[PDB]
Amino acid sequence: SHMRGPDPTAASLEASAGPFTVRSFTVSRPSGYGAGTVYYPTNAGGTVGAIAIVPGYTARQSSIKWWGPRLASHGFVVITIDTNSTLDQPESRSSQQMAALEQVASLNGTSSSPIYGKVDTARMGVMGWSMGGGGSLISACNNPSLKAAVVQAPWHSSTNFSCVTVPTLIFACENDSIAPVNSSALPIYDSMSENAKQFLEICGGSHSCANTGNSDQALIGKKGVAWMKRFMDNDTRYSTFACENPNSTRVCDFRTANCS
């Protein structure tokens, strides 16, 4: 019972910004991770959940930053991070992701912070690209109270994510050469038995097909926002957009199970 904003439409979800005004700040003393930018709604009308987003191997915040304003404008506090090192592996990335959520919780309690009192610390979600995606799944396995996960071209040495009980959306990139769909994304998707889950493969995509500047932001943004609003807010006004096949020629494989 955490509704923010009006009933959504396709158009309102496809737009570059949702209903809320977004401001941001850069974390002064990032504690447990490399750097962070916090995006927040000024006017969501209530506390909102928090989401931490982690980049890929070799990559920096810029690679995933487009998600920060996109999600925050629909009613989330969103921290986009740099890892301690561009060469951190998935386990490290998961620890840093959780550290980022932890510092957002601290700042929610800090009267000097722009996000003072804006966060519902009981409602948190995880996202990431590449190893940041594999780290997000680790996070969800270790912390089953997380409300949702949205990952893109996830990377891990294993495909065994049967441990993920949280609602999980996987964006895959059809022609990914780093994390091939058939040997990575689809096995990971199929390993999950215990949860609402979805698999959306972007036609022609390379490993970076869901990153900042991508050609499919209306589609990808609509789906990521819809999944987060549905599951982080238990907002069934978003069931339509979270669960649907989005009838897009830019989707080359779509699967979902246990969605409502």
UniProtKB/Swiss-Prot annotation:
Pathway: Xenobiotic degradation. Induction: Highly up-regulated during growth on PET film. InterPro entries: AB_hydrolase_fold (IPR029058), FrsA_esterase (IPR050261), PET_hydrolase/cutinase-like (IPR041127). The keyword Ion transport does not apply. Poly(ethylene terephthalate) binds at Y57, M131, W155. The active site is at S130 (nucleophile), D176 (charge relay system), H207 (charge relay system). GO terms for cellular component: extracellular region. Changing Q89A: Displays decreased enzymatic activity on PET bottle and on BHET. Changing W155A: Exhibits highly impaired PET degradation capacity relative to wild-type PETase. Also displays decreased enzymatic activity on BHET. Changing W129H: Displays increased enzymatic activity on PET bottle and on BHET. Exhibits improved PET and PEF degradation capacity relative to wild-type PETase. Has potential for application in environmental remediation and biological recycling of PET and PEF waste products. Changing S63M: Increases activity towards 1-naphthyl butyrate. Keywords: Disulfide bond, Hydrolase, Secreted, Serine esterase, Signal. Involved in the degradation and assimilation of the plastic poly(ethylene terephthalate) (PET), which allows I.sakaiensis to use PET as its major energy and carbon source for growth. Likely acts synergistically with MHETase to depolymerize PET. Catalyzes the hydrolysis of PET to produce mono(2-hydroxyethyl) terephthalate (MHET) as the major product. Also depolymerizes another semiaromatic polyester, poly(ethylene-2,5-furandicarboxylate) (PEF), which is an emerging, bioderived PET replacement with improved gas barrier properties. Monomer. This is Poly(ethylene terephthalate) hydrolase.
